[PDB]
Amino acid sequence: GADAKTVQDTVTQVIEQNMNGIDNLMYMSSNSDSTGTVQITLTFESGTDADIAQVQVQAKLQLAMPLLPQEVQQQGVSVEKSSSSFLMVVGVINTDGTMTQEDISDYVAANMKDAISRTSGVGDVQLFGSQYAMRIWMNPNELNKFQLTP
C-alpha cells in the first residue's frame, strides 16, 4: 500500500543507518518504489566469498527489524544472492482442461516453486503471477448499511 516517500524512510533509511561494520565493501545503492517495495544492493570486492558477504548483512539489517512497521515485518524480508539476469525460465500453460492465468500461478507456487528455489543453489526465484489467498472485497455501501468499518 505504501507510497515511495513512505518506504524511503520507514524501512529503507533505517536499514541504511544500520548497514555498517561489514567486512569488504565498494558501495551501497537503493531503490524505493511507489508500489511499496524496497531493495538495497551491497556490492563487494572481486573474488570475495558470497557465503560470508551475506550473513553479516542479514545481522545488521536484523538489528533494525524492530524499528519498522509490521505491515513490513511479517511481510517477506529477504537477504539473497544476486545475478542481474535470468537463465532457465519455465513457462507453464494449459491445453486440455482449460484454466486461468491465476489458477496456474497458484499451482506453480504450491508444488514446484518451493522445491526449485531450494534446489541446487538458486539465488532467488520470481513468480510470474501470485500464490492464492483468501481474498475479500469489502463493500462500503453494505458496511454503512449495518453500521460498520473495515
Binding site: 515511495a4 518504489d33 508500489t35 525460465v89 483468501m134 454503512n144 473495515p150
Partner: protein, 399 residues
C-alpha cells in the same frame, strides 16, 4: 604503420553474440494503467509472431514488470528464437532482428518500446560507455536535486563535442493524491485516528490480516474492497468511519482532496539520496575522455551537490592494465633469453620480431569489421610466443 594501425583501431571488451535468446522491454508515460500497457505488449507480440514466423519459435510477455523496476507502467517480452540451423543469413540473426524491431516500435506506437542485445558478460563494460551518479551531499531535498540533475543533462547536450548521449534512469515524476486529515475536526465528532488510518489502508492498498489453510498448504488472507469503490478521488467520501457516539461519519467531513507532485522511484546512494545518470561515451571520444568532461560539468553545479561513479568500473583492460601487462611480459622474455643464451644481442633479435607478426594481426582486425577486444588481445600474445619460437630457431641453430 604498426602504431597508426593500433591507435586508430578502436577498443572494445567483448562482442555481443547471437545467443538464440534476446528480449525487449516496455514503459508507459506518467501514471498509466495495466489496461494501457497491455495494448502495447499485444502489439509487440504481433511483430514476433505474424511478421517473424521463420525466426521466432516463441514469446513470453509480462504485464507490469520492467528490468528498471515495477508497477503497471512497465513490461517485458522474453524471446526464444528458432534453432541456428533454420536461421540461415545475417538478416535472420539477433542483430538484424532487433534492428527492424526497434524501427517498428518507434513507427506505429506512441510510448517507449525498444528491443536490445543480450551481451553475455553482465550489465557493465559496454565500452565507450559510462554510468554517472549525482548525490545530495548537503541537506537539500528531492525538489532541489531534481533541478540540479536537469542542469547536468542540459549542459551535456548543450555543448557536445564530440557530442555524446545522456539520459536519466527511471525517475519519471508523476502526480500523487494527498489526503490532509484535520485533527481538530476528527476529535470533535468523536473518531479515533487509528480507526481512520486502517480504513484508508485496508481498503485502498490492502492489509495483511491472518494466515489460513487452503488444500493442505498455508497461504495468506487479504482485505481490501471491490474495485468499483476505489478508482477515483470522488470515491473516498463513500467510506463511512464509525464514531464513539454510534453514528456514521463520512471521509468528506475530516478529509481534504488535493493533488501533488512527487516521485515514484526514490533512489539513494550510500546513505544519502541520489539520481542515476545513464550516459554513453561519444561516437568520436571514448570514456576516459567523456567521463572527465562530465566531472567539470558537475563541479559547475550549485552548492550541496556532489558526485560519485556507480557501478564503472575499477580500472580496465586495453585501458590502464594492458600496458603494465605487456611491460613486464618484456622484462621476463628478455631475461629468460639470456638464462639460455648470453650476449647482449641474441634477445634483441627476438625482441623485434614482435612488430613483424603484429602489423599483420592488426591488418586483419582493422580490415574486417572486428576490433581490439579480449580475444584479439590474446591473439597478439600468442604470436610473440610463435615469433620467439620461429626466431629462436634462427638464433639457436645458427649460434
Amino acid at each position: 604503420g604498426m602504431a597508426y594501425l593500433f591507435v586508430r583501431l578502436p577498443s572494445s571488451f567483448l562482442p555481443d553474440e547471437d545467443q538464440g535468446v534476446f528480449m525487449t522491454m516496455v514503459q508507459l508515460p506518467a501514471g498509466a494503467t495495466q489496461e494501457r500497457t497491455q495494448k502495447v505488449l499485444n502489439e509487440v507480440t504481433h511483430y514476433y509472431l505474424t511478421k517473424e514466423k521463420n525466426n521466432v519459435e516463441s514469446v513470453f510477455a509480462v504485464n507490469g514488470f520492467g528490468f528498471a523496476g515495477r508497477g503497471q507502467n512497465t513490461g517485458i517480452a522474453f524471446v526464444s528464437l528458432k534453432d541456428w540451423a533454420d536461421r540461415p543469413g545475417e538478416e535472420n540473426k539477433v542483430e538484424a532482428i532487433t534492428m527492424r524491431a526497434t524501427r517498428a516500435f518507434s513507427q506505429i506506437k506512441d510510448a517507449m518500446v525498444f528491443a536490445f542485445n543480450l551481451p553475455a558478460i553482465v550489465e557493465l563494460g559496454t565500452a565507450t560507455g559510462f554510468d554517472f551518479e549525482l548525490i545530495d551531499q548537503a541537506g537539500l531535498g528531492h525538489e532541489k536535486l531534481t533541478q540540479a540533475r536537469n542542469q547536468l543533462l542540459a549542459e551535456a547536450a548543450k555543448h557536445p563535442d564530440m557530442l555524446t548521449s545522456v539520459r536519466p534512469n527511471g525517475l519519471e515524476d508523476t502526480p500523487q493524491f494527498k489526503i490532509d486529515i484535520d485533527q481538530e475536526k476528527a476529535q470533535a465528532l468523536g473518531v479515533s485516528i487509528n480507526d481512520i488510518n486502517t480504513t484508508l489502508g485496508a481498503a485502498w492498498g490492502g492489509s495483511y490480516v491472518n494466515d489460513f489453510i487452503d488444500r493442505g498448504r498455508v497461504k495468506k488472507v487479504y482485505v481490501m474492497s471491490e474495485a468499483k469503490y476505489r478508482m477515483l478521488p470522488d470515491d473516498i467520501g463513500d467510506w463511512y468511519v464509525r464514531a464513539a457516539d454510534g453514528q456514521m461519519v463520512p471521509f468528506s467531513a475530516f478529509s481534504s482532496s488535493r493533488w501533488e507532485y512527487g516521485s515514484p522511484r526514490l533512489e539513494r546512494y550510500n546513505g544519502l539520496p541520489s539520481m542515476e545518470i545513464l550516459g554513453q561515451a561519444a561516437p568520436g571520444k571514448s570514456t576516459g575522455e567523456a567521463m572527465e568532461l562530465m566531472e567539470q560539468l558537475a563541479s559547475k553545479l550549485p552548492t550541496g551537490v556532489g558526485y560519485d561513479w556507480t557501478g564503472s568500473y575499477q580500472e580496465r583492460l586495453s585501458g590502464n592494465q594492458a600496458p603494465s601487462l605487456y611491460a613486464i611480459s618484456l622484462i621476463v622474455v628478455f631475461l629468460c633469453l639470456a638464462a639460455l643464451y648470453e650476449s647482449w644481442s641474441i634477445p634483441f633479435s627476438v625482441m623485434l620480431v614482435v612488430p613483424l607478426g603484429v602489423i599483420g594481426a592488426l591488418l586483419a582486425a582493422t580490415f574486417r569489421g572486428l576490433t581490439n577486444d579480449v580475444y584479439f588481445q590474446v591473439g597478439l600474445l600468442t604470436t610473440i610466443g610463435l615469433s620467439a619460437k620461429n626466431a629462436i630457431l634462427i638464433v639457436e641453430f645458427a649460434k
